[PDB]
Motif scaffolding. Structure first.
Motif, PDB file in Angstrom:
ATOM      1  N   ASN A  56       0.997  -1.025  -0.011  1.00  0.00           N
ATOM      2  CA  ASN A  56      -0.242  -0.230  -0.185  1.00  0.00           C
ATOM      3  C   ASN A  56       0.786   1.304  -0.086  1.00  0.00           C
ATOM      4  OD1 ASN A  56      -2.580  -1.205   2.412  1.00  0.00           O
ATOM      5  ND2 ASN A  56      -2.158  -1.980   0.094  1.00  0.00           N
ATOM      6  N   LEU A  57       1.825   0.719   0.906  1.00  0.00           N
ATOM      7  CA  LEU A  57       2.980   2.355   0.634  1.00  0.00           C
ATOM      8  C   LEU A  57       3.378   2.797  -0.096  1.00  0.00           C
ATOM      9  CD1 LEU A  57       5.402   1.167   3.767  1.00  0.00           C
ATOM     10  CD2 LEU A  57       3.458   3.054   3.339  1.00  0.00           C
ATOM     11  N   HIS A  58       3.659   4.381  -0.720  1.00  0.00           N
ATOM     12  CA  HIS A  58       4.397   4.509  -2.261  1.00  0.00           C
ATOM     13  C   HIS A  58       5.856   3.626  -2.334  1.00  0.00           C
ATOM     14  CE1 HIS A  58       6.336   7.175  -4.937  1.00  0.00           C
ATOM     15  NE2 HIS A  58       5.478   7.699  -5.056  1.00  0.00           N
ATOM     16  N   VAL A  59       6.051   3.382  -3.528  1.00  0.00           N
ATOM     17  CA  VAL A  59       7.179   2.039  -3.245  1.00  0.00           C
ATOM     18  C   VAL A  59       8.525   3.171  -3.664  1.00  0.00           C
ATOM     19  CG1 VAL A  59       8.337   2.015  -5.791  1.00  0.00           C
ATOM     20  CG2 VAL A  59       6.347   1.965  -5.533  1.00  0.00           C
ATOM     21  N   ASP A  60       8.241   4.544  -3.606  1.00  0.00           N
ATOM     22  CA  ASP A  60       9.785   4.852  -2.288  1.00  0.00           C
ATOM     23  C   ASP A  60       9.866   4.814  -1.316  1.00  0.00           C
ATOM     24  OD1 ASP A  60       9.692   8.208  -4.928  1.00  0.00           O
ATOM     25  OD2 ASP A  60      10.695   6.079  -5.325  1.00  0.00           O
ATOM     26  N   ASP A  61       8.504   4.913  -0.510  1.00  0.00           N
ATOM     27  CA  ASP A  61       8.346   5.301   1.039  1.00  0.00           C
ATOM     28  C   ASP A  61       9.064   3.143   1.080  1.00  0.00           C
ATOM     29  OD1 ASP A  61       7.597   7.929   1.032  1.00  0.00           O
ATOM     30  OD2 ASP A  61       5.563   7.030   1.406  1.00  0.00           O
ATOM     31  N   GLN A  62       8.383   2.472   0.423  1.00  0.00           N
ATOM     32  CA  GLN A  62       9.173   1.073   0.830  1.00  0.00           C
ATOM     33  C   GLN A  62      10.656   0.915   1.107  1.00  0.00           C
ATOM     34  OE1 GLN A  62       5.148  -0.693  -2.047  1.00  0.00           O
ATOM     35  NE2 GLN A  62       7.201  -2.120  -1.986  1.00  0.00           N
ATOM     36  N   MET A  63      11.242   1.829   0.365  1.00  0.00           N
ATOM     37  CA  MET A  63      12.480   1.459  -0.209  1.00  0.00           C
ATOM     38  C   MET A  63      12.973   2.050   0.664  1.00  0.00           C
ATOM     39  SD  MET A  63      15.437   2.646  -3.163  1.00  0.00           S
ATOM     40  CE  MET A  63      15.885   4.596  -1.525  1.00  0.00           C
ATOM     41  N   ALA A  64      12.371   2.655   1.082  1.00  0.00           N
ATOM     42  CA  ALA A  64      13.335   4.025   2.872  1.00  0.00           C
ATOM     43  C   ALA A  64      12.734   3.396   3.364  1.00  0.00           C
ATOM     44  CB  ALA A  64      12.485   5.195   2.636  1.00  0.00           C
ATOM     45  N   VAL A  65      11.492   3.202   4.510  1.00  0.00           N
ATOM     46  CA  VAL A  65      11.494   2.476   5.742  1.00  0.00           C
ATOM     47  C   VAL A  65      12.053   0.742   5.820  1.00  0.00           C
ATOM     48  CG1 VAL A  65       9.371   3.262   5.933  1.00  0.00           C
ATOM     49  CG2 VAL A  65       9.168   1.041   5.059  1.00  0.00           C
ATOM     50  N   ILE A  66      12.333   0.122   4.927  1.00  0.00           N
ATOM     51  CA  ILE A  66      13.322  -1.373   4.832  1.00  0.00           C
ATOM     52  C   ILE A  66      14.772  -0.210   5.539  1.00  0.00           C
ATOM     53  CG2 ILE A  66      14.527  -2.852   3.145  1.00  0.00           C
ATOM     54  CD1 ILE A  66      11.963  -3.027   1.893  1.00  0.00           C
ATOM     55  N   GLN A  67      15.547   0.275   4.369  1.00  0.00           N
ATOM     56  CA  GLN A  67      17.066   0.817   4.457  1.00  0.00           C
ATOM     57  C   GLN A  67      16.501   1.881   5.950  1.00  0.00           C
ATOM     58  OE1 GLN A  67      18.102   3.588   0.979  1.00  0.00           O
ATOM     59  NE2 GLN A  67      18.331   1.147  -0.509  1.00  0.00           N
ATOM     60  N   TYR A  68      16.166   2.551   6.416  1.00  0.00           N
ATOM     61  CA  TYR A  68      16.601   3.490   7.901  1.00  0.00           C
ATOM     62  C   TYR A  68      16.156   2.107   8.843  1.00  0.00           C
ATOM     63  CZ  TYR A  68      14.623   7.199   5.357  1.00  0.00           C
ATOM     64  OH  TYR A  68      15.261   8.682   4.129  1.00  0.00           O
ATOM     65  N   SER A  69      14.824   1.266   8.572  1.00  0.00           N
ATOM     66  CA  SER A  69      14.626   0.143   9.885  1.00  0.00           C
ATOM     67  C   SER A  69      15.284  -0.962   9.164  1.00  0.00           C
ATOM     68  CB  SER A  69      12.905  -0.290  10.337  1.00  0.00           C
ATOM     69  OG  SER A  69      11.747   0.645  10.094  1.00  0.00           O
TER      70      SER A  69
END
Ligand SMILES: C[C@](O)(COc1ccc(C#N)c2ccccc12)C(=O)Nc1ccc(C#N)c(C(F)(F)F)c1
Length: 238
Positions: A56-69
């Motif tokens: 559901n998350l925006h494609v950019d947000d998906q990559m971002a949260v994975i990397q931050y977390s």
């Protein structure tokens, strides 16, 4: 249904490929930790994308949260493995990369390791169940974002809320939720010390004979600084 899914997508064991027949050395231990992290990321991405509602998350947000977390997720998972496999006696980074106190010291990551061992012990002290572990770990993926917000903050807020609700259900209570949220918050400062360590090492990597894998080097130089400079911050319950 929810727990069935988390159980089903939980990654199997990931090995570092470390040579345990060679005397310990800073260079060798760190090259293995780096390689292990890079191997783990591959599975974290596949795992995350298979999580309920993640698409559901925006494609950019998906990559971002994975990397931050990423760091937090591994610290949590590693602490759990250490608890279940060796009752927190040692740090179980991987079946072929188990850290005793000597390795903790030689890696120059002693303080961070001790904190992760304490986290490992917490799983035992609080008698965390495998199901609570799974839900808490999923929640950790939604616990660090940019101060400026994501591309689609609304979808993220909705997803995080839903995961907190699943934790609620697994608990069903107030005292337990207090303990678990306090435990989750404790992961962040530990991940922070590791982020700092990783950043400092990369900057001086060419002087300590350490080698950084492609994805890790990018994330450390692009994403981690956002965290260390305060542009990206964890979400604490307390
Ligand atoms: C020194 C280093 O090779 C640096 O590796 C990383 C640099 C930047 C990251 C970012 N962002 C990052 C995110 C995730 C993992 C590693 C990362 C290391 O710490 N490796 C390591 C390998 C496996 C586990 C495990 N499990 C852990 C553990 F989490 F600390 F336990 C640590």
């Amino acid at each position: 249904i929810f727990l069935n899914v988390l159980e089903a997508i939980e990654p199997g064991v990931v090995c570092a490929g470390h040579d345990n027949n060679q005397p310990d050395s800073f260079a060798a231990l760190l090259s293995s930790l780096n390689e292990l992290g890079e191997r783990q990321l591959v599975h974290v991405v596949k795992w995350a994308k298979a999580l309920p509602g993640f698409r559901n998350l925006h494609v950019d947000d998906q990559m971002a949260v994975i990397q931050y977390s990423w760091m937090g997720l591994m610290v949590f998972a590693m602490g759990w493995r250490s608890f279940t496999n060796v009752n927190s006696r040692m740090l179980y980074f991987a079946p072929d990369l188990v850290f005793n106190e000597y390795r903790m010291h030689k890696s120059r990551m002693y303080s961070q390791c001790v904190r992760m061992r304490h986290l490992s012990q917490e799983f035992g002290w609080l008698q965390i169940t495998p199901q609570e572990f799974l839900c808490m770990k999923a929640l950790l993926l939604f616990s660090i974002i940019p101060v400026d917000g994501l591309k689609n903050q609304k979808f993220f807020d909705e997803l995080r809320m839903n995961y907190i609700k699943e934790l609620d259900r697994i608990i069903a209570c107030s005292r337990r939720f207090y303990q678990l949220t306090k435990l989750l918050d404790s992961v962040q400062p530990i991940a922070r010390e590791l982020h700092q360590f990783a950043f400092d090492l990369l900057i001086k990597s060419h002087m300590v004979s350490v080698d950084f894998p492609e994805m890790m080097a990018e994330i450390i130089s692009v994403q981690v600084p956002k965290i260390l400079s305060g542009k990206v911050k964890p979400i604490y319950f307390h």
